[model samples]
Target: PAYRILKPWWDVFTDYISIVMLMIAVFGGTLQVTQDKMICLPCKWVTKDSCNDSTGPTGIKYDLDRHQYNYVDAVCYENRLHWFAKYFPYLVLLHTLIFLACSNFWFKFPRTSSKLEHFVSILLKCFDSPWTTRALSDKKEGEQAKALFEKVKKFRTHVEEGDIVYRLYMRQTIIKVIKFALIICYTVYYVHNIKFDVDCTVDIESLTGYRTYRCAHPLATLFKILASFYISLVIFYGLICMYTLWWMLRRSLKKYSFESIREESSYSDIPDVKNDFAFMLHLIDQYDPLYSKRFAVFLSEVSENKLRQLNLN
Candidate 1:
């Protein structure tokens, strides 16, 4: 019943998906802010330095500086545009910090010997259940499976010593906490520096006069508030997702340990359970269809067959 309730494969898959989503959100936000300058391609254009500058429809001078204009500057020139761009960095920083925290958890925490090690050890124990033993034994006849079982045995031996998992989990937790704190600091800095315009209406006569144009600072303020709110929402959801994952992993590990130590199977009955499970314990030892030479060869053959079919058709 517990095995039916706890799907380690699904948990593993979802964890990977969450990581990918976080990465995309952080990188996408970074690109939105930084890509304007970095991704622009070179092309000849009329400029103030080049002479004979063609005035655009907005009556603004074209290519006046001979270099690409700053996108941020252009946005700032407009009343509403300036408001959002000014606070963009805060949103970007929040996304980046959260991404880093999740990434550290994914790669660093699982391998740790501290709490994480204990957790994983417990989870491995769960796999020692009757159903798990049967599944593993069923595959032991194949040469590939036999080799995999041997590797699992070696890994289990190391896990039982309890040395490996403690160090790894502690290191990752420390790093995650530090980065999370930095994110909060950056968020406060952005909030404190926020600016808003007070003027509701501007005198029309002053516009044509020598006086400087009045900016809609209030609207900009409103935009900043909205952007801040959106960023906060993302942070809130991200934290929730991560907390949920942590709970799931902890629960699974506890259940696994209880089941594993209590299982009745003898060494003679399930010769490969210990071996196969030991192999599965190490993150590096998990089967990867993409990395196998045999898989690669099969893929090439399949690709050729597809090509032949396409040509015949």
Candidate 2:
């Protein structure tokens, strides 16, 4: 049930990053909902209204009571704000959701899930087997330990017939990498939508004596900051995904060599494995090579032979 141990380090890390992104999107949406979207005042005062206030400076003096400010705010929000800016949080939310789904898709999928589930349960059993602990000891082998060899061999026989797990992992990583690139590029391109200053034609001269308004989005500055941070997180995520690909392609995971394990243990005849069996062990190595090292005990013919001798008694 300890599924966390099954997932590689990068995947676990990416899930956390995606969660951060989801929180950011939620926070921004909440802010937008609870706060006034923008504030607008006349670019130049119309000469017809002399209710102008000189509280700020001699330049662009436009006086607005709460009523006029509310009017301008409503008008600007209804007609002037860009669509992307209005729905930015939703966009981010959708993106993060899709990304999380893709990253974790295989775990829930029926075809891949079966193999993963079987591998994880059996791997846990192998790691926790009493024989595993005894295998490294100077104590003589026991018959009960021999049972593990048969299980490991059977599992390998069933899984090694094909490379389904490896191929699925490869495809999933590729999709994540491509998604990362698209998200980074499009988000950067659309970032300009969160402009602090926007010019709008209010056409409400009858009420405020000003037809043109210069609008300032009170939330846009914060939105820009959040977007920049999100972009940085995404870039880091993309790089990590690229690293995953590089790691996968750097070696042929189809075949795994047990030379080091052999050197460490007396089971010098421990044979190598190929296909999905080897790939699963490689993934286990990413968690900790010690696991696969210990697992090599069950795969050693010499160890199995000694265990068979004990079983005959």
Candidate 3:
């Protein structure tokens, strides 16, 4: 019986987590594809060293190493693009692993109240059986028996409430803990790989015969800071969504469990418990649809709408 109650919620949580993870993965892949190179048309015409703003024609060039474009020759642009492409897969894999870890935990450790309910019921019944009751009564321990029954009932109630609390608080907290840990691990891995691949030098004459890498400038630094802030906002929003789901699940579970217990204990001939139970069940059905399908549609549609609004696609 406990399992029956919890199974639906558990399944819903897992499905939502998986969908969010998949969305993140898709976003990561898109970042990899889009940021892999920046194209410059004029760079292809002039020699690598000669293609400066003053010398080059408007020829197309892609800096694969830097994943950026410059008004320079094809050879220089290709070198930069090549370097950037090498790290693209690494970034994608890191994002994928972080999301995968989150999904794994969601499936494995989802808070399910049904299992707790089943175990509690079994234990309560064991203590209330004829043999156990007979022995207690024979000992003239009627008070003890009565106390035990009361305690068992209270225990069951506590278990139900505790399950709801755990689902509400710990579910998203655990997922966030795992995600933060993965983020740290991936960040370290990314930095280490970047250090190994890119040679940073102040003396630009030795490498590109320029004063410095153009991206090392203050404007680029400011842009990176802004970008990081935006990304952080996205992460925070995701966490908020996860916690919101947890709260909704907790509220639904609590209402359902309370209604169920009330119906079971009521001695009224009318047995109006069915109506209460049905109402709670309907609430669950309407609010929980496994995944946020509407949200997904909104995300997809908005991207297209934005492109149309800008007249860019």
lDDT of 2 by residue, 13-106 (tens): 8889889999999988887778746777675543433222337666545666897888788888888887777777888899888778876676
Which number leads on lDDT?
2
TM-score of each model, paired residue for residue: 0.38, 0.84, 0.32
Backbone clash count, each prediction separately? 16, 0, 18
Give candidate 1's TM-score: 0.38
Tens-place lDDT digits, model 3, residues 8-83: 4444554455455455445545655564333333222234333444487894433344422243333333454334
Best-fitting candidate, measured by TM-score? 2
Q: What lDDT is reached at residue 174 by model 2? A: 93
* Ranking, lDDT, top scorer first: 2, 3, 1
lDDT of 1 by residue, 1-313 (tens): 2222222342345345445445544544564455322111112232432222235566433232323233322323433233334446455555556545644454345444243444344444433323233332232223333333444445445545554433333344445446445656665565644454321111222222211222233333543554465456445544644564464346432112212222432122222222222222332123332122121111132322333454345
Q: After superposition, how far is residue 237 of candidate 2 from its true place, in Å?
A: 1.4
